[PDB]
């Protein structure tokens with residue numbers, strides 16, 4: 160599985176998702192920076208937080224930004240690529256490189272309603288909250304999950320991570336345009352309208368498509384027309 | 397009952413060089429990968445089955461697995477193409 164010592168991704172790299180990201184920080188960032196306070200008042204922080212929503216909406220992005228802001232190790236697992244030994248080994252490493260944010264992608268692929276599943280429940284009952292290992296899970300179908308995962312002391316904190324709304328889309332386009340010279344007359348709002356029902360991944364792929372055309376034209380920056388051809392290009396996929 | 401799929405020459409070789417390609421090569425590659433996926437998708441249309449008898453299932457199982465590997469590669473292509481692209485405008 161993929162391990163990143165300390166990912167260099169700030170909250171500044173996440174377009175929109177303000178309410179959710181704050182919910183996440185209340186659930187993970189807070190008990191990490193000040194675990195004693197949760198002991199003083201005497202309440203356990205959530206061991207696991209489930210991020211459900213469509214793909215390319217920034218579930219991974221959120222989990223990496225937390226791991227960044229909290230100076231932790233980021234260890235990611237792909238749920239389909241697990242399809243039990245490896246789960247134990249995982250959490251073992253996770254404890255070893257603490258602080259650690261474990262990100263279980265495609266958790267539904269192993270947690271529908273077997274050996275590997277049971278292991279994950281064990282590992283999470285294992286380590287205790289206030290501890291410096293926290294779990295974040297990502298899925299499409301929270302409906303399809305086995306109710307053992309959502310029971311307290313596991314993934315007992317749920318956060319919807321939906322598609323970018325008209326405005327969130329503007330940010331995401333700009334976000335991937337930052338390291339990239341851009342004309343001052345560029346209409347970011349018109350772009351947000353033409354990218355109806357787009358996701359973060361696709362919106363990033365627009366900026367990649369735009370900067371290509373500008374380069375192909377030997378422009379010194381990316382013009383608004385480039386982006387629209389980019390959106391045009393991206394639409395066909 | 398497909399036989400009309402276009403085939404990707406030197407693809408698995410070019411795919412493995414994404415991190416070491418220049419931008420122009422990535423552009424040609426991206427276009428080629430997409431051309432391959434268009435052919436795969438035409439087929440997923442003919443069965444009328446989206447990406448989500450017994451010799452049916454096996455092909456569809458493989459068809460899907462192929463697209464996903466292609467999508468995972470094209471994704472990598474763009475993440476790298478993006479970084480190289482960002483280096484161009486910081487260069488300036």
Ligand SMILES: Nc1ncnc2c1ncn2[C@@H]1O[C@H](COP(=O)(O)OP(=O)(O)OP(=O)(O)O)[C@@H](O)[C@H]1O
Nearest residue numbers: 172173174214215216217218219220331359360363
């Ligand atoms: N809100 C966002 N702001 C900026 N970029 C985004 C956002 N959401 C997604 N992206 C871009 O989309 C790509 C995929 O993002 P990410 O993997 O975080 O989404 P995800 O929901 O975790 O996808 P998956 O379903 O594969 O887990 C990333 O390269 C990221 O740059």
